[PDB]
């Protein structure tokens, strides 16, 4: 993580998987249908974007 | 009196059919509370009280049709 043009800072950020999306304390507030594997397809996507924001 | 007395028993067994509204009715009202708290345990002391209110409303059909049977067996 570039803090400045003359300094950098190593950064770490966790990537929560599908299994961790269910046990999410605040999940019931969001409507969702357990039919389209929403949690399953969120992992395969989050893992892509977070990785892209890390490299870019 | 014999022909009119016999109609007292026939009419009493039919007035029990009107009690289906309380069996299936109260079922749905109570079933909603079960599917509700599950999807959202946060709200309990808010849906539970109103759920009971729906009971007395659906219990009506189970009281009126219930009294009709007594007005043909122990009433008339």
PDB file of N, CA and C in Angstrom, chain B:
ATOM      1  N   UNK B   1     -92.973 -34.803  19.375  1.00  0.00           N
ATOM      2  CA  UNK B   1     -91.838 -34.313  18.602  1.00  0.00           C
ATOM      3  C   UNK B   1     -90.819 -35.418  18.358  1.00  0.00           C
ATOM      4  N   UNK B   2     -90.530 -35.680  17.087  1.00  0.00           N
ATOM      5  CA  UNK B   2     -89.571 -36.713  16.716  1.00  0.00           C
ATOM      6  C   UNK B   2     -88.836 -36.348  15.430  1.00  0.00           C
ATOM      7  N   UNK B   3     -89.587 -35.889  14.432  1.00  0.00           N
ATOM      8  CA  UNK B   3     -89.011 -35.508  13.146  1.00  0.00           C
ATOM      9  C   UNK B   3     -88.145 -34.251  13.273  1.00  0.00           C
ATOM     10  N   UNK B   4     -88.595 -33.304  14.092  1.00  0.00           N
ATOM     11  CA  UNK B   4     -87.855 -32.067  14.325  1.00  0.00           C
ATOM     12  C   UNK B   4     -86.677 -32.273  15.281  1.00  0.00           C
ATOM     13  N   UNK B   5     -86.798 -33.258  16.166  1.00  0.00           N
ATOM     14  CA  UNK B   5     -85.725 -33.584  17.099  1.00  0.00           C
ATOM     15  C   UNK B   5     -84.532 -34.185  16.364  1.00  0.00           C
ATOM     16  N   UNK B   6     -84.815 -35.011  15.361  1.00  0.00           N
ATOM     17  CA  UNK B   6     -83.768 -35.661  14.580  1.00  0.00           C
ATOM     18  C   UNK B   6     -82.919 -34.647  13.813  1.00  0.00           C
ATOM     19  N   UNK B   7     -83.531 -33.528  13.438  1.00  0.00           N
ATOM     20  CA  UNK B   7     -82.832 -32.478  12.705  1.00  0.00           C
ATOM     21  C   UNK B   7     -81.869 -31.713  13.608  1.00  0.00           C
ATOM     22  N   UNK B   8     -82.027 -31.887  14.916  1.00  0.00           N
ATOM     23  CA  UNK B   8     -81.154 -31.236  15.886  1.00  0.00           C
ATOM     24  C   UNK B   8     -79.773 -31.883  15.900  1.00  0.00           C
ATOM     25  N   UNK B   9     -79.725 -33.186  15.633  1.00  0.00           N
ATOM     26  CA  UNK B   9     -78.460 -33.915  15.611  1.00  0.00           C
ATOM     27  C   UNK B   9     -77.760 -33.781  14.260  1.00  0.00           C
ATOM     28  N   UNK B  10     -78.545 -33.762  13.188  1.00  0.00           N
ATOM     29  CA  UNK B  10     -78.003 -33.624  11.839  1.00  0.00           C
ATOM     30  C   UNK B  10     -77.382 -32.247  11.637  1.00  0.00           C
ATOM     31  N   UNK B  11     -78.028 -31.223  12.185  1.00  0.00           N
ATOM     32  CA  UNK B  11     -77.535 -29.861  12.079  1.00  0.00           C
ATOM     33  C   UNK B  11     -76.337 -29.585  12.968  1.00  0.00           C
ATOM     34  N   UNK B  12     -76.177 -30.389  14.015  1.00  0.00           N
ATOM     35  CA  UNK B  12     -75.072 -30.215  14.954  1.00  0.00           C
ATOM     36  C   UNK B  12     -73.773 -30.798  14.411  1.00  0.00           C
ATOM     37  N   UNK B  13     -73.892 -31.855  13.612  1.00  0.00           N
ATOM     38  CA  UNK B  13     -72.732 -32.505  13.026  1.00  0.00           C
ATOM     39  C   UNK B  13     -72.193 -31.753  11.830  1.00  0.00           C
ATOM     40  N   UNK B  14     -73.005 -30.853  11.284  1.00  0.00           N
ATOM     41  CA  UNK B  14     -72.594 -30.049  10.133  1.00  0.00           C
ATOM     42  C   UNK B  14     -71.950 -28.742  10.582  1.00  0.00           C
ATOM     43  N   UNK B  15     -72.366 -28.241  11.742  1.00  0.00           N
ATOM     44  CA  UNK B  15     -71.824 -26.988  12.258  1.00  0.00           C
ATOM     45  C   UNK B  15     -70.382 -27.150  12.734  1.00  0.00           C
ATOM     46  N   UNK B  16     -69.914 -28.393  12.790  1.00  0.00           N
ATOM     47  CA  UNK B  16     -68.532 -28.680  13.165  1.00  0.00           C
ATOM     48  C   UNK B  16     -67.592 -28.485  11.977  1.00  0.00           C
ATOM     49  N   UNK B  17     -68.150 -28.532  10.771  1.00  0.00           N
ATOM     50  CA  UNK B  17     -67.367 -28.329   9.555  1.00  0.00           C
ATOM     51  C   UNK B  17     -66.845 -26.898   9.474  1.00  0.00           C
ATOM     52  N   UNK B  18     -67.574 -25.971  10.086  1.00  0.00           N
ATOM     53  CA  UNK B  18     -67.181 -24.573  10.090  1.00  0.00           C
ATOM     54  C   UNK B  18     -65.993 -24.288  10.992  1.00  0.00           C
ATOM     55  N   UNK B  19     -65.531 -25.309  11.708  1.00  0.00           N
ATOM     56  CA  UNK B  19     -64.410 -25.155  12.631  1.00  0.00           C
ATOM     57  C   UNK B  19     -63.067 -25.400  11.950  1.00  0.00           C
ATOM     58  N   UNK B  20     -63.102 -25.666  10.648  1.00  0.00           N
ATOM     59  CA  UNK B  20     -61.879 -25.861   9.880  1.00  0.00           C
ATOM     60  C   UNK B  20     -61.104 -24.558   9.768  1.00  0.00           C
ATOM     61  N   UNK B  21     -61.827 -23.445   9.812  1.00  0.00           N
ATOM     62  CA  UNK B  21     -61.216 -22.135   9.696  1.00  0.00           C
ATOM     63  C   UNK B  21     -60.283 -21.831  10.851  1.00  0.00           C
ATOM     64  N   UNK B  22     -60.514 -22.489  11.981  1.00  0.00           N
ATOM     65  CA  UNK B  22     -59.696 -22.273  13.168  1.00  0.00           C
ATOM     66  C   UNK B  22     -58.516 -23.236  13.207  1.00  0.00           C
ATOM     67  N   UNK B  23     -58.678 -24.392  12.575  1.00  0.00           N
ATOM     68  CA  UNK B  23     -57.624 -25.387  12.539  1.00  0.00           C
ATOM     69  C   UNK B  23     -56.523 -24.990  11.581  1.00  0.00           C
ATOM     70  N   UNK B  24     -56.910 -24.688  10.347  1.00  0.00           N
ATOM     71  CA  UNK B  24     -55.954 -24.296   9.322  1.00  0.00           C
ATOM     72  C   UNK B  24     -55.607 -22.817   9.438  1.00  0.00           C
ATOM     73  N   UNK B  25     -56.587 -22.010   9.831  1.00  0.00           N
ATOM     74  CA  UNK B  25     -56.382 -20.581   9.985  1.00  0.00           C
ATOM     75  C   UNK B  25     -55.304 -20.245  10.996  1.00  0.00           C
ATOM     76  N   UNK B  26     -55.532 -20.630  12.248  1.00  0.00           N
ATOM     77  CA  UNK B  26     -54.574 -20.373  13.319  1.00  0.00           C
ATOM     78  C   UNK B  26     -53.225 -21.003  12.995  1.00  0.00           C
ATOM     79  N   UNK B  27     -53.255 -22.072  12.207  1.00  0.00           N
ATOM     80  CA  UNK B  27     -52.031 -22.750  11.799  1.00  0.00           C
ATOM     81  C   UNK B  27     -51.124 -21.825  10.996  1.00  0.00           C
ATOM     82  N   UNK B  28     -51.692 -21.174   9.986  1.00  0.00           N
ATOM     83  CA  UNK B  28     -50.932 -20.269   9.130  1.00  0.00           C
ATOM     84  C   UNK B  28     -50.414 -19.062   9.907  1.00  0.00           C
ATOM     85  N   UNK B  29     -51.264 -18.505  10.767  1.00  0.00           N
ATOM     86  CA  UNK B  29     -50.895 -17.339  11.564  1.00  0.00           C
ATOM     87  C   UNK B  29     -49.740 -17.653  12.505  1.00  0.00           C
ATOM     88  N   UNK B  30     -49.774 -18.840  13.098  1.00  0.00           N
ATOM     89  CA  UNK B  30     -48.731 -19.257  14.026  1.00  0.00           C
ATOM     90  C   UNK B  30     -47.485 -19.688  13.255  1.00  0.00           C
ATOM     91  N   UNK B  31     -47.694 -20.274  12.080  1.00  0.00           N
ATOM     92  CA  UNK B  31     -46.588 -20.737  11.245  1.00  0.00           C
ATOM     93  C   UNK B  31     -45.713 -19.583  10.762  1.00  0.00           C
ATOM     94  N   UNK B  32     -46.324 -18.419  10.566  1.00  0.00           N
ATOM     95  CA  UNK B  32     -45.594 -17.238  10.117  1.00  0.00           C
ATOM     96  C   UNK B  32     -44.609 -16.765  11.181  1.00  0.00           C
ATOM     97  N   UNK B  33     -45.005 -16.887  12.444  1.00  0.00           N
ATOM     98  CA  UNK B  33     -44.136 -16.519  13.557  1.00  0.00           C
ATOM     99  C   UNK B  33     -42.916 -17.431  13.610  1.00  0.00           C
ATOM    100  N   UNK B  34     -43.096 -18.686  13.213  1.00  0.00           N
ATOM    101  CA  UNK B  34     -41.996 -19.645  13.203  1.00  0.00           C
ATOM    102  C   UNK B  34     -41.020 -19.360  12.064  1.00  0.00           C
ATOM    103  N   UNK B  35     -41.532 -19.027  10.883  1.00  0.00           N
ATOM    104  CA  UNK B  35     -40.646 -18.721   9.756  1.00  0.00           C
ATOM    105  C   UNK B  35     -40.045 -17.325   9.868  1.00  0.00           C
ATOM    106  N   UNK B  36     -40.568 -16.540  10.802  1.00  0.00           N
ATOM    107  CA  UNK B  36     -40.143 -15.163  10.956  1.00  0.00           C
ATOM    108  C   UNK B  36     -38.948 -15.032  11.872  1.00  0.00           C
ATOM    109  N   UNK B  37     -39.084 -15.555  13.086  1.00  0.00           N
ATOM    110  CA  UNK B  37     -38.016 -15.483  14.073  1.00  0.00           C
ATOM    111  C   UNK B  37     -36.766 -16.192  13.565  1.00  0.00           C
ATOM    112  N   UNK B  38     -36.962 -17.219  12.743  1.00  0.00           N
ATOM    113  CA  UNK B  38     -35.846 -17.973  12.185  1.00  0.00           C
ATOM    114  C   UNK B  38     -35.008 -17.099  11.261  1.00  0.00           C
ATOM    115  N   UNK B  39     -35.687 -16.377  10.379  1.00  0.00           N
ATOM    116  CA  UNK B  39     -35.020 -15.520   9.409  1.00  0.00           C
ATOM    117  C   UNK B  39     -34.506 -14.241  10.065  1.00  0.00           C
ATOM    118  N   UNK B  40     -34.960 -13.981  11.288  1.00  0.00           N
ATOM    119  CA  UNK B  40     -34.586 -12.765  12.004  1.00  0.00           C
ATOM    120  C   UNK B  40     -34.908 -12.835  13.494  1.00  0.00           C
ATOM    121  N   UNK B  41     -34.015 -13.453  14.280  1.00  0.00           N
ATOM    122  CA  UNK B  41     -34.215 -13.621  15.723  1.00  0.00           C
ATOM    123  C   UNK B  41     -34.183 -12.291  16.469  1.00  0.00           C
ATOM    124  N   UNK B  42     -33.743 -11.237  15.791  1.00  0.00           N
ATOM    125  CA  UNK B  42     -33.614  -9.924  16.413  1.00  0.00           C
ATOM    126  C   UNK B  42     -34.955  -9.428  16.936  1.00  0.00           C
ATOM    127  N   UNK B  43     -35.982  -9.549  16.104  1.00  0.00           N
ATOM    128  CA  UNK B  43     -37.321  -9.105  16.472  1.00  0.00           C
ATOM    129  C   UNK B  43     -38.139 -10.262  17.035  1.00  0.00           C
ATOM    130  N   UNK B  44     -38.335 -10.253  18.347  1.00  0.00           N
ATOM    131  CA  UNK B  44     -39.083 -11.319  18.996  1.00  0.00           C
ATOM    132  C   UNK B  44     -40.218 -10.746  19.831  1.00  0.00           C
ATOM    133  N   UNK B  45     -39.882  -9.827  20.732  1.00  0.00           N
ATOM    134  CA  UNK B  45     -40.874  -9.199  21.597  1.00  0.00           C
ATOM    135  C   UNK B  45     -41.703  -8.164  20.837  1.00  0.00           C
ATOM    136  N   UNK B  46     -41.707  -8.266  19.511  1.00  0.00           N
ATOM    137  CA  UNK B  46     -42.497  -7.367  18.675  1.00  0.00           C
ATOM    138  C   UNK B  46     -43.490  -8.137  17.809  1.00  0.00           C
ATOM    139  N   UNK B  47     -43.062  -9.292  17.309  1.00  0.00           N
ATOM    140  CA  UNK B  47     -43.914 -10.126  16.466  1.00  0.00           C
ATOM    141  C   UNK B  47     -44.706 -11.138  17.295  1.00  0.00           C
ATOM    142  N   UNK B  48     -44.137 -11.544  18.426  1.00  0.00           N
ATOM    143  CA  UNK B  48     -44.781 -12.493  19.331  1.00  0.00           C
ATOM    144  C   UNK B  48     -46.098 -11.957  19.901  1.00  0.00           C
ATOM    145  N   UNK B  49     -46.102 -10.700  20.380  1.00  0.00           N
ATOM    146  CA  UNK B  49     -47.326 -10.129  20.957  1.00  0.00           C
ATOM    147  C   UNK B  49     -48.432  -9.982  19.919  1.00  0.00           C
ATOM    148  N   UNK B  50     -48.090  -9.478  18.738  1.00  0.00           N
ATOM    149  CA  UNK B  50     -49.074  -9.314  17.675  1.00  0.00           C
ATOM    150  C   UNK B  50     -49.559 -10.671  17.163  1.00  0.00           C
ATOM    151  N   UNK B  51     -48.683 -11.670  17.203  1.00  0.00           N
ATOM    152  CA  UNK B  51     -49.043 -13.022  16.785  1.00  0.00           C
ATOM    153  C   UNK B  51     -50.203 -13.563  17.615  1.00  0.00           C
ATOM    154  N   UNK B  52     -50.169 -13.294  18.918  1.00  0.00           N
ATOM    155  CA  UNK B  52     -51.241 -13.708  19.818  1.00  0.00           C
ATOM    156  C   UNK B  52     -52.544 -12.985  19.476  1.00  0.00           C
ATOM    157  N   UNK B  53     -52.431 -11.731  19.045  1.00  0.00           N
ATOM    158  CA  UNK B  53     -53.602 -10.946  18.659  1.00  0.00           C
ATOM    159  C   UNK B  53     -54.320 -11.591  17.480  1.00  0.00           C
ATOM    160  N   UNK B  54     -53.547 -12.143  16.551  1.00  0.00           N
ATOM    161  CA  UNK B  54     -54.105 -12.831  15.401  1.00  0.00           C
ATOM    162  C   UNK B  54     -54.802 -14.117  15.797  1.00  0.00           C
ATOM    163  N   UNK B  55     -54.397 -14.674  16.932  1.00  0.00           N
ATOM    164  CA  UNK B  55     -55.004 -15.895  17.444  1.00  0.00           C
ATOM    165  C   UNK B  55     -56.476 -15.681  17.799  1.00  0.00           C
ATOM    166  N   UNK B  56     -56.750 -14.662  18.608  1.00  0.00           N
ATOM    167  CA  UNK B  56     -58.118 -14.350  19.016  1.00  0.00           C
ATOM    168  C   UNK B  56     -59.005 -13.986  17.827  1.00  0.00           C
ATOM    169  N   UNK B  57     -58.396 -13.459  16.769  1.00  0.00           N
ATOM    170  CA  UNK B  57     -59.139 -13.086  15.570  1.00  0.00           C
ATOM    171  C   UNK B  57     -59.557 -14.321  14.786  1.00  0.00           C
ATOM    172  N   UNK B  58     -58.665 -15.303  14.730  1.00  0.00           N
ATOM    173  CA  UNK B  58     -58.932 -16.539  14.010  1.00  0.00           C
ATOM    174  C   UNK B  58     -59.676 -17.535  14.892  1.00  0.00           C
ATOM    175  N   UNK B  59     -59.612 -17.321  16.202  1.00  0.00           N
ATOM    176  CA  UNK B  59     -60.315 -18.172  17.155  1.00  0.00           C
ATOM    177  C   UNK B  59     -61.814 -17.886  17.120  1.00  0.00           C
ATOM    178  N   UNK B  60     -62.185 -16.749  16.537  1.00  0.00           N
ATOM    179  CA  UNK B  60     -63.589 -16.370  16.421  1.00  0.00           C
ATOM    180  C   UNK B  60     -64.391 -17.445  15.692  1.00  0.00           C
ATOM    181  N   UNK B  61     -63.925 -17.824  14.506  1.00  0.00           N
ATOM    182  CA  UNK B  61     -64.594 -18.847  13.711  1.00  0.00           C
ATOM    183  C   UNK B  61     -64.675 -20.183  14.449  1.00  0.00           C
ATOM    184  N   UNK B  62     -63.791 -20.375  15.423  1.00  0.00           N
ATOM    185  CA  UNK B  62     -63.767 -21.599  16.206  1.00  0.00           C
ATOM    186  C   UNK B  62     -64.635 -21.523  17.448  1.00  0.00           C
ATOM    187  N   UNK B  63     -65.234 -20.359  17.674  1.00  0.00           N
ATOM    188  CA  UNK B  63     -66.129 -20.157  18.809  1.00  0.00           C
ATOM    189  C   UNK B  63     -67.582 -20.091  18.350  1.00  0.00           C
ATOM    190  N   UNK B  64     -67.841 -19.296  17.317  1.00  0.00           N
ATOM    191  CA  UNK B  64     -69.190 -19.167  16.778  1.00  0.00           C
ATOM    192  C   UNK B  64     -69.741 -20.519  16.334  1.00  0.00           C
ATOM    193  N   UNK B  65     -69.007 -21.204  15.462  1.00  0.00           N
ATOM    194  CA  UNK B  65     -69.431 -22.511  14.968  1.00  0.00           C
ATOM    195  C   UNK B  65     -69.473 -23.539  16.092  1.00  0.00           C
ATOM    196  N   UNK B  66     -68.741 -23.261  17.165  1.00  0.00           N
ATOM    197  CA  UNK B  66     -68.714 -24.143  18.325  1.00  0.00           C
ATOM    198  C   UNK B  66     -69.974 -23.970  19.165  1.00  0.00           C
ATOM    199  N   UNK B  67     -70.467 -22.738  19.241  1.00  0.00           N
ATOM    200  CA  UNK B  67     -71.677 -22.439  20.000  1.00  0.00           C
ATOM    201  C   UNK B  67     -72.920 -22.952  19.284  1.00  0.00           C
ATOM    202  N   UNK B  68     -72.860 -22.994  17.957  1.00  0.00           N
ATOM    203  CA  UNK B  68     -73.986 -23.466  17.158  1.00  0.00           C
ATOM    204  C   UNK B  68     -74.299 -24.931  17.447  1.00  0.00           C
ATOM    205  N   UNK B  69     -73.267 -25.714  17.747  1.00  0.00           N
ATOM    206  CA  UNK B  69     -73.460 -27.127  18.053  1.00  0.00           C
ATOM    207  C   UNK B  69     -74.150 -27.323  19.405  1.00  0.00           C
ATOM    208  N   UNK B  70     -73.840 -26.454  20.366  1.00  0.00           N
ATOM    209  CA  UNK B  70     -74.466 -26.525  21.685  1.00  0.00           C
ATOM    210  C   UNK B  70     -75.914 -26.034  21.650  1.00  0.00           C
ATOM    211  N   UNK B  71     -76.222 -25.159  20.697  1.00  0.00           N
ATOM    212  CA  UNK B  71     -77.580 -24.648  20.534  1.00  0.00           C
ATOM    213  C   UNK B  71     -78.457 -25.635  19.770  1.00  0.00           C
ATOM    214  N   UNK B  72     -77.942 -26.842  19.562  1.00  0.00           N
ATOM    215  CA  UNK B  72     -78.686 -27.878  18.856  1.00  0.00           C
ATOM    216  C   UNK B  72     -78.654 -29.186  19.639  1.00  0.00           C
ATOM    217  N   UNK B  73     -77.812 -29.232  20.667  1.00  0.00           N
ATOM    218  CA  UNK B  73     -77.679 -30.423  21.497  1.00  0.00           C
ATOM    219  C   UNK B  73     -78.071 -30.134  22.942  1.00  0.00           C
ATOM    220  N   UNK B  74     -77.531 -29.051  23.492  1.00  0.00           N
ATOM    221  CA  UNK B  74     -77.816 -28.671  24.871  1.00  0.00           C
ATOM    222  C   UNK B  74     -78.545 -27.331  24.934  1.00  0.00           C
ATOM    223  N   UNK B  75     -79.071 -26.898  23.793  1.00  0.00           N
ATOM    224  CA  UNK B  75     -79.761 -25.627  23.713  1.00  0.00           C
ATOM    225  C   UNK B  75     -81.142 -25.755  23.089  1.00  0.00           C
ATOM    226  N   UNK B  76     -81.240 -25.406  21.811  1.00  0.00           N
ATOM    227  CA  UNK B  76     -82.483 -25.469  21.064  1.00  0.00           C
ATOM    228  C   UNK B  76     -83.560 -24.512  21.635  1.00  0.00           C
TER     229      UNK B  76
END
